Ligand binder design. Structure first.
Ligand SMILES: Cc1cc(N)c2ccccc2[n+]1CCCCCCCCCC[n+]1c(C)cc(N)c2ccccc21
Length: 574
């Protein structure tokens, strides 16, 4: 028989092959950094110095033949293509008429962006996240933000994945006009210019390739030479651990919505839809697409953009077009893909899209039932309430009244139920609506007792400015605080108030607050009670479930209350 092949490990890239080529140690345009191949090119060098070399070789993976070719004397290179990622025991055999001899088996890795070559991720979850047996029909969603791996120090292996059905990854930008990104400060707009170099406008890109796929995380077993690293490699390993988890890229958001306003022109929608198909074929751990255009008709970050006439029909066409493209991918892959969108729930946002039309294309609507009041002005109120608070004036709730100056309210006040009823009344199915919970507060300072028109209620006061604080307190920008910050700095373990704060609750609105009467610091947020109320409301109306913004700001209490409030409930999936 021929001499047995001896595999030249170093001549064969130590048997590590990848279907994706990712640029490391540089930041450049997306199409220069990211190259995907439907088949891996496998090249393995072997030698047969002693004896006869034979005529033909065969390559086996886990004892099954996967390739054959000719022997070329004393040194041969087996080259073939392979589609399926994984770890395999490889043997190379040489054959001629006298018989066949085979190399010792050696492990070959073929990396793919489904994580098929990876072991389940090792988790490091705060044990204050408890175990539940929520029915699997109910949505339990959250957003994980790409930048939370820096100062926020919150990584993929910190998420309480057993308690989540859907992780929305915030956020994939669209190349094009993006002046609103300058409001984040820092390198964000410039990093986007770099990512979009050589990329057509209206195509998606990765905003931060360091965080997405270059950074080595030691908890994930990454090495500098590992071919996929970052958050994305951890998300692939997380999908191996929890295969029924849905991980969905969120495109846009408040900061990154400026290109959507140009989707009135179908040519820019076609460019975008094709880029998203490409993106989902490249990053196979993703399960659909979430569109967070804030907002059709304007009212977002870009004060000079928004078309109340034309953006709704653009949004609806976008959904129709995306769903045609996702049906293509389902045909091609045999998988199921979801299409979702997070939306504004003020009456002035909902009036600009005919959701009765759009929702036929969509699996879920993530209703942004938060941010109703905030430090952008000096008017206190409940930022994430279900119902109208005590502080509101007569007629403010339904919009028929007049304000303190005699001026008509223009529409119903910003509460979750005013928005959810407007969507239900036009025929959006309850089982496609997901209700938002906040894992953060918004706040003011200067709300001292002398400013209240009702002494029992600080939401009747007036502020002098935004809440101020440090990042160790969870205050990453003035006026906003992480829930885990409110717990450590204002509530305490017993939830009765520390550091001069007192807790209160508006039982009509279903909304908690903490208030320090000395400093006038007042923070509106969601807590165990108000999230239980949201779960109960979701069970009562047959909503699909709950989601939250943003997971890194919870200490487990808010996700636990999301589950607790849904106990017993089931829903018909869309
Ligand atoms: C930090 C960070 C870090 C990054 N690398 C980053 C990268 C990409 C995108 C965002 C990024 N972010 C920022 C992510 C920002 C998430 C939250 C944005 C919503 C802000 C509230 C919106 N809002 C509402 C609703 C109503 C108002 N009247 C109003 C008035 C003034 C200002 C805002 C107002």
């Amino acid at each position: 028989a021929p001499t047995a092949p001896s595999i030249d490990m170093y001549g064969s890239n130590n048997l590590q092959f990848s279907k994706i080529e990712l640029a490391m140690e540089t930041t450049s345009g997306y199409n220069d950094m990211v190259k995907y191949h439907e088949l891996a090119k496998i090249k393995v060098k072997f030698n047969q110095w002693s004896g006869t070399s034979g005529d033909t070789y065969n390559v086996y993976f886990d004892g099954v033949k996967v390739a054959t070719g000719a022997i070329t004397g004393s040194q041969t290179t087996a080259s073939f293509e392979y589609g399926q990622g994984g770890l395999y025991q490889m043997e190379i055999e040489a054959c001629d008429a006298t018989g066949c001899s085979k190399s010792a088996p050696v492990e070959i890795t073929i990396a793919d962006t489904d994580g098929s070559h990876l072991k389940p991720l090792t988790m490091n979850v705060d044990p204050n996240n408890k175990s539940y047996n929520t029915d699997p029909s109910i949505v339990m969603g959250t957003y994980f933000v790409e930048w939370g791996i820096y100062g926020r120090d919150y990584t993929v292996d910190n998420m309480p994945v057993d308690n989540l059905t859907h992780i929305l990854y915030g956020f994939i930008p669209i190349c094009g006009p993006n002046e609103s990104v300058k409001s984040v400060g820092g390198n964000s707009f410039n990093a986007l210019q770099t990512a979009c170099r050589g990329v057509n406008d209206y195509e998606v890109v990765i905003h931060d390739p360091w965080a997405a796929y270059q950074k080595s995380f030691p908890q994930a077993g990454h090495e500098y030479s590992t071919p996929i690293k970052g958050n994305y490699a951890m998300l692939m390993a997380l999908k191996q651990r929890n295969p029924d988890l849905k991980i969905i890229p969120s495109i846009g958001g408040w900061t990154l919505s400026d290109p959507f306003y140009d989707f009135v022109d179908k040519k820019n929608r076609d460019t975008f839809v094709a880029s998203v198909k490409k993106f989902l074929k490249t990053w196979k751990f993703y399960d659909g697409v979430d569109i967070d255009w804030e907002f059709p008709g304007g009212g977002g970050a870009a004060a000079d953009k928004g078309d109340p006439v034309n953006d709704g029909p653009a949004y609806i066409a976008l959904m129709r077009e995306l769903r045609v493209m996702l049906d293509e991918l389902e045909a091609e892959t045999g998988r199921t893909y979801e299409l979702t969108s997070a939306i504004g729930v003020g009456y002035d946002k909902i009036e600009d899209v005919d959701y009765a039309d759009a929702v036929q294309y969509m699996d879920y609507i993530f209703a942004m039932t938060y941010d109703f009041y905030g430090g952008w002005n000096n008017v206190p109120g409940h930022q994430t309430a279900l119902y109208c608070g005590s502080f509101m004036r007569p007629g403010q709730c339904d919009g028929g009244g007049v304000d303190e100056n005699g001026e008509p309210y223009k529409g119903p006040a910003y509460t979750a139920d005013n928005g959810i009823q407007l969507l239900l009344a036009q025929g959006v199915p309850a089982n496609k609506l997901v209700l938002g919970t906040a894992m953060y507060g918004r706040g003011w300072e200067g709300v001292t007792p002398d400013t209240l028109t009702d002494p029992n209620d600080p939401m009747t006061g007036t502020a002098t400015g935004k809440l101020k604080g440090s990042t160790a307190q969870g205050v990453w920008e003035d006026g906003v605080i992480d829930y885990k910050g409110i717990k450590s700095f204002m509530l305490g373990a017993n939830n009765t108030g520390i550091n001069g704060f007192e807790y209160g609750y508006d039982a009509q609105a279903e909304a908690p607050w903490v208030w320090n009467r000395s400093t006038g610091e007042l923070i509106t947020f969601d807590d165990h009670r108000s999230v239980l109320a949201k779960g109960n409301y979701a069970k009562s109306l047959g909503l699909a479930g709950l989601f939250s913004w943003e997971i890194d700001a919870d200490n487990g209490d808010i996700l636990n209350a999301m589950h607790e409030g849904m106990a017993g409930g089931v829903v018909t999936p869309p």
